[PDB]
Amino acid sequence: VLQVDIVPSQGEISVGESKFFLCQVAGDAKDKDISWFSPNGEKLSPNQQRISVVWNDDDSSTLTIYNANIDDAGIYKCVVTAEDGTQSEATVNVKIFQKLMFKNAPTPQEFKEGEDAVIVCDVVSSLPPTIIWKHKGRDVILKKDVRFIVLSNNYLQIRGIKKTDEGTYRCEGRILARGEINFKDIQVIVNVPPTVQARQSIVNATANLGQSVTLVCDADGFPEPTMSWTKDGEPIENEDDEKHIFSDDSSELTIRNVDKNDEAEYVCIAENKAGEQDASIHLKVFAK
Amino acid sequence: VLQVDIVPSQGEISVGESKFFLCQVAGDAKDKDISWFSPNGEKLSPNQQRISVVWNDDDSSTLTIYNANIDDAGIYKCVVTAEDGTQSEATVNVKIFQKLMFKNAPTPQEFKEGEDAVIVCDVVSSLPPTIIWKHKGRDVILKKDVRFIVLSNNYLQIRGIKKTDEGTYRCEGRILARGEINFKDIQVIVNVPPTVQARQSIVNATANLGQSVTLVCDADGFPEPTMSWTKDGEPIENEDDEKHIFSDDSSELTIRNVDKNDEAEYVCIAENKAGEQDASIHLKVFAK
């Protein structure tokens, strides 16, 4: 009697992806029923959303598995029933797996100079991945710079990270059985705490002569330090400004019409995401 | 003698992707040479960039094909040569293909109400794709709204597109032999040309009484029309403003200290990306 075949004859679907299968009946005289059954033995209701069974013509029926998940795995079968109740079937083994992909591998990843840096790279795959970390083409391992280590979770550890260690690092995953490869480039940034020094620690000025004085601090670090000042411990707003004028980086503070109220200890605070350092300047104002 | 095997025993790579193959020698007493030959018979130089051959231990050699292209297809072979010149080989058939993917399928795609809209969806695949266009879950075809047609290039044509045709349209590609599915959602936007009418076509004002007059045009369309005005054909800048004050949409123009120089024909131009329409207002100014 009847011939039923499913194309493709077998299938594999990665979690979250979709695949379809066509159950075809041979010759096809009509008035026969075509029904699909899932791996758990249940008959699939036609025209549903995710596990879709769509009759095409009286010759075939298509099973589409959208957004696959592990519980979709198994032998699905297509049964054909002739007007007299005689039945024929074709079965199809559907495997579900997780293709090698990156789940969490942020870029860039930043570290403070000197700390032990751990570069995070989270992969997912049904079969266990072999991970290789690459820098500038090489395998950071085969060089044996004792500071480089691949941890049990496959993250790259760079002990006492140096400013010269920044750059792009490649996290490469391989699955031997499938000869599968996927990789991700991660930019590593090293931040350096600020250091700062006053250009002049002591400054003397004369009051009420309408003159200005410029206080200067020289700082560096990475990212470039942002400067803020204090007058005897009290903040000084960068803002409108009539008296206090700051440079773009605020590394320079210009006091405009100097009078005795300007005499104080000024502190320039240099900060960036990795730290802080300050320096003081003593301004003394003498009556004219 | 010697046993040589390649894992995976066979492989398929989509253009632009990567795969690797491990050639392993059995038992492995040493001092034997392992070399790979490409499909064109040439011996591969070790440690190159794209077509990478890397010796692991004296037991194996790994061939990695990065960023694959059609000319990489073929039988690669791994040859093992023992100290006495006796050789053994393993071959691996590497197929190259183009997995079903979208090359150009911009979203959103915009059309002017009434024109024939063609929604562009360019796919690529080694095997010819079957394309299905879906709206709100359905297949725009099986409804037979004569205005909907899938063209020879597989684009969706929507004749005399209506504002009520906008929404998301799904371009779904299927390859039967592989039960492969990939889709792309495309937001279709329909723009409507502006129409505009003056609220008052004729306006009379008295000069030098320090009073204002407000000219108003009511417009609509999609996107919301932007308004610009002209005084006897000359533009009027929206800008500082002391005399001419515009509403946010500039649908209203307020003339402030009316004097005879304000008497003129004012035109409000309503525009959006789909078109334009204007209306005129005649302001007559009488001496006080």
From Swiss-Prot, chains A, B:
Domain of life, per lineage: Eukaryota
Compartments where located: Cell membrane
Disulphide linkage map: 23-78, 121-171, 217-268
Record domain Ig-like C2-type: where: 2-93, 98-187, 194-282
Residues that bind heparin: 134-138, 143-147
Glycosylation sites: 204
Post-translational modification: Polysialylated by ST8SIA2 and ST8SIA4. Polysialylation modulates cell interactions by confering both attractive and repulsive properties that are highly regulated by ST8SIA2 and ST8SIA4. Polysialylation is formed on a-2,3-linked sialic acid of core glycans.
Known function: This protein is a cell adhesion molecule involved in neuron-neuron adhesion, neurite fasciculation, outgrowth of neurites, etc.
Subunit structure: Interacts with MDK. Found in a complex with SLC39A6, SLC39A10 and with NCAM1; this complex controls NCAM1 phosphorylation and integration into focal adhesion complexes during epithelial-tomesenchymal transition. Interacts with synaptic plasticity regulator PANTS.
Protein name: Neural cell adhesion molecule 1
Gene field: Ncam1
Residues of the full protein shown: 20 to 308 of 858
